Amino acid sequence: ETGDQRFGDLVFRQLAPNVWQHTSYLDMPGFGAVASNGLIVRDGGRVLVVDTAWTDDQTAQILNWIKQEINLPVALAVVTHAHQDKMGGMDALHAAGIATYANALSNQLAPQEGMVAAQHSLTFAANGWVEPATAPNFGPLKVFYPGPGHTSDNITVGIDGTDIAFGGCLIKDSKAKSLGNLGDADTEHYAASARAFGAAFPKASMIVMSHSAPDSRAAITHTARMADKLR
Ligand SMILES: NCc1ccc2sc([B-](O)(O)O)cc2c1
Ligand SMILES: [Ca+2]
Ligand SMILES: [Ca+2]
Ligand SMILES: [Zn+2]
Ligand SMILES: [Zn+2]
């Protein structure tokens, strides 16, 4: 699509003056190439990343695109649950010297999920908001744990000062026919978790998600409506 850029195997789309979507692809036998999206945020003189790519090599391509196109140091990455599309590239982040953060529960599940744990653990209050001392110097990133849904550990991120919030694999697009990979999902709590994400970021109008292009808030309510039928 127009204005998108491609570096190696990766596609980048600018969403706002300081925010880009990164997209990487992995051949899933019997589906074909599955896109996964994350975010890149320029926060003054540094960059913040949300989610790895599927693989280490793809994640290194993100970092080199950042070097070439933004030319600011990457201060930290937040990864949104312990599955390959979101944490497959941890080793590349660590090799590059980027501090990594994930839900404590993601870090605990990581070995069991075949992922490398982050260096730091985020913890959350009963209302879902990150405990701030666990997310030092996060700039505009506002991290929210909406409850179990796509996985028990899934987290979400709003970008303060912008219209954007990132639902990761929890949120599906508003035309979707299904909730995707439910293999690790909590079918009972999913709908409430989707709605909690919407209530956490009530003014966000651009909802970015792992497996579809950015959508409106319709993605949230549609996701929740689909999830209500799992119960
Ligand atoms: N090659 C493993 C493989 C293939 C497709 C998906 S999709 C996915 B999820 O969206 O649930 O996080 C992880 C995953 C892992
Ligand atoms: Ca690895
Ligand atoms: Ca699993
Ligand atoms: Zn997943
Ligand atoms: Zn996914």
Side-chain angles (χ1 to χ4, degrees), residues 191-231:
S193 298
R195 292 189 172 99
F197 167 71
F201 302 108
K203 303 182 165 167
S205 54
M206 178 183 275
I207 305 305
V208 180
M209 69 207 82
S210 292
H211 304 294
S212 298
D215 201 355
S216 71
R217 297 185 66 83
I220 305 166
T221 61
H222 183 69
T223 293
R225 181 183 184 205
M226 290 194 290
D228 289 327
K229 297 192 182 317
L230 306 169
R231 280 170 58 75

Side-chain angles (χ1 to χ4, degrees), residues 82-83 109 112-114 151 181 183-184:
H83 279 165
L109 290 172
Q112 247 191 116
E113 294 295 319
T151 59
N181 186 164
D184 290 13

Side-chain angles (χ1 to χ4, degrees), residues 18-20 38-44 46-51 74-80 98-102 122 124 129-132 134-144 155-162 164-166 200-201:
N18 296 308
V19 183
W20 299 258
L39 289 171
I40 303 171
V41 178
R42 172 171 52 208
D43 173 32
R46 70 196 184 137
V47 170
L48 316 174
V49 171
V50 180
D51 290 338
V74 181
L76 60 90
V78 173
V79 295
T80 63
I98 294 166
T100 57
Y101 294 80
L122 303 175
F124 298 88
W129 289 105
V130 67
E131 296 231 329
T134 76
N137 302 127
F138 266 41
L141 300 185
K142 303 305 185 191
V143 187
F144 181 75
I155 61 170
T156 69
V157 184
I159 316 295
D160 196 46
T162 79
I164 296 167
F166 181 72
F201 302 108

Side-chain angles (χ1 to χ4, degrees), residues 2-3 15 26 33 35 54 75 83 119 123 191 194 228:
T2 321
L15 302 183
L26 179 274
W54 296 95
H83 279 165
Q119 293 177 315
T123 64
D228 289 327

Side-chain angles (χ1 to χ4, degrees), residues 159-183:
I159 316 295
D160 196 46
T162 79
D163 298 330
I164 296 167
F166 181 72
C169 309
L170 177 70
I171 302 302
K172 314 311 174 166
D173 69 90
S174 58
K175 291 174 175 185
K177 82 311 319 153
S178 83
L179 290 168
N181 186 164
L182 289 174

